[PDB]
Amino acid sequence: SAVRSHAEAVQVSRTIDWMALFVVFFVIVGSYHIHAMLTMGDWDFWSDWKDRRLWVTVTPIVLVTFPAAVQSYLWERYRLPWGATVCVLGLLLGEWINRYFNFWGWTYFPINFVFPASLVPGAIILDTVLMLSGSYLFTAIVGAMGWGLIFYPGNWPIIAPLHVPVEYNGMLMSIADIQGYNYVRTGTPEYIRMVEKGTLRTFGKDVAPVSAFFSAFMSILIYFMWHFIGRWFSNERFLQS
């Protein structure tokens, strides 16, 4: 036999558990980080890109992709409810490593100007909803609604001190706006930032809630599609050519 005793089998299984956790975690880090940055990283890099319309709308929709697939695999095959949490934690770890060692360690951009957005509460909501309900349709709908809606309230304690108005050289500016102005991004001019500028159809203080609800609806859709995407990605098929 491969193993000589039950205790040896348990120890071998624990070693395999640790090694497979390492493999899954860091492959997820690589893939999720590349997808997340090349989908929404301009808003995540700079504090003056963290607006109420585009950041709040875009970030959860594109970030709900990997958690859906990883949940569809882990909960179905192992009853492990931490897929969304592990995806968010890996993305945050990679982003923070890059910000501290490259954004600040190399180009000396201040950390308070280059910090990632908080994402743990949405992953926790998704994971808990999936674990308690046990059905992927209800998880999709309700958990994606929560994931979309909790993104901006979760990040508000961080960005709130950066929105104190300042009279800078005769013009009204935000602290994040002054941060973007002072610290020169040679490759990132001011016109590139996709932030809300006001529309003639913009109503009475409804920008952030409308963006959050739109993000939640699109998160429902993207979760529903990426659940089946991950189901396909979990196939155990062998080819002969």
Partner: protein
């Protein structure tokens, strides 16, 4: 850095930066340097570059070695993107504050939406001191003075660490048990319902409720701590005041313009008519940040980057006082290693072999007229 690789004709035909000044060449940490000058938008704007309806005045440097304290276009502060008109000249001023020590090549640039970067002449500036001495004080409308280098850093660290710790605890609660193989076998065997207990459900409910309640309480506390907040200020600022400059009493027609392809020079036949302003003489030809000067007529005293300054790179067949009214056809020869160093000789690879530049005419009293020339450039191979 980054201009030598840009197409020569694109550099010749977009924006012209004329008389520029730098307040200091060597600065200490927290000291300010002022870069002023004029920029002219070429009338024959290239079609592949969008019109500068949305343009941003930027500083080209390898990072935040300086901080841009302020920037003015036509005397008006321009923290946002602006709108520029084709064929108009604008004053610009940029005040920067030294942050990091070292020798830095600083350029003034116009980023144009749908076009890309338009880099101007770069100057080497030395910063002496320690980066730890740099301070960025800002006074808010609420009566608080803060330092932007470290403001809100601890709060961000605390919140990110708190949420990361919550996620790690959530994972580690399930990580105390066998993870992958026994659970997979149990699920395959049909014993999945045995892998989650009532205590696990209660823990998940507590985690969800605590997460929601903590988010709500944190938002309420942040609102209480900062009751006055404004959204990010953005938009394109129109109505930039251009320069009202004297029209050139001097008329210049380009008969022919040629460059030898091996080649480190450019040659042009020009017909010049003086419409008054006393006998005049050509003193300088500006092409793409490169200034070819005629030492006998004009001498630079502004510390123009020497790699871009050819003190005797202008050779005019006859540069004698052009009596008001005289129409002389002259053969001008602009020669300098900068032609090859700044890869202006790479116009041979360009899908448009046409050049544009500025000619500067000086009278006996020293008054200067600026004439704008554009023509096709023909390579010579024989």
């Amino acid at each position: 850095h980054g201009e030598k690789s840009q197409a020569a004709f694109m550099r010749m035909r977009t924006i012209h930066w004329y008389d520029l000044s730098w307040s200091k060449e060597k600065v200490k940490i927290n000291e300010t340097v002022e870069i002023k000058g004029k920029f002219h938008v070429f009338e024959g704007w290239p079609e592949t570059v969008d019109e500068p309806d949305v343009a941003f005045l930027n500083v080209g440097m390898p990072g935040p070695v300086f901080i841009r304290k302020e920037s003015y276009i036509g005397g008006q502060l321009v923290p946002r993107s602006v709108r520029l008109e084709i064929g108009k000249t604008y004053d610009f001023r940029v005040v920067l504050k030294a942050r990091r020590p070292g020798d830095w090549h600083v350029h003034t640039m116009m980023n144009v939406q749908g076009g890309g970067p338009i880099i101007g002449p770069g100057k080497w500036i030395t910063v002496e001191g320690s980066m730890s001495e740099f301070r960025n004080p800002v006074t808010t409308l609420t009566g608080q003075t803060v330092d932007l280098e470290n403001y809100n850093e601890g709060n961000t660290y605390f919140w990110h660490a708190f949420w990361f710790a919550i996620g790690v605890a959530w994972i580690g609660y399930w990580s105390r048990r066998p993870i992958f193989i026994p659970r997979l076998l149990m699920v395959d065997a049909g014993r999945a319902d045995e892998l989650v207990s009532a205590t696990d459900r209660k823990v998940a409910m507590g985690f969800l409720a605590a997460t929601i309640l903590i988010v709500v309480m944190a938002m309420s506390s942040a609102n209480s701590k900062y009751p006055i907040t404004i959204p990010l200020q953005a938009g394109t600022m129109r109505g930039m005041k251009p320069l009202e400059l004297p029209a050139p009493t001097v008329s210049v027609k380009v008969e022919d313009a040629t460059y030898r392809v091996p080649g480190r020079a450019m040659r042009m036949k020009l017909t010049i008519t003086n419409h008054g302003n006393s006998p005049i003489r050509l003193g300088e030809f500006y092409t793409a940040s490169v200034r070819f000067l005629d030492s006998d007529v004009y001498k630079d005293t502004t510390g123009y980057p020497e790699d871009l300054l050819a003190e005797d790179g202008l050779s005019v067949s006859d540069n004698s006082p052009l009596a008001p009214g005289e129409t002389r056809t002259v053969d001008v020869t602009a020669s300098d290693a900068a032609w090859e160093v700044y890869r202006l000789s790479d116009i041979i690879y360009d899908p448009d072999s046409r050049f544009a530049g500025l000619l500067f005419f000086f009278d006996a009293t020293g008054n200067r007229q600026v004439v704008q020339i554009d023509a096709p450039l023909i390579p010579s191979f024989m």
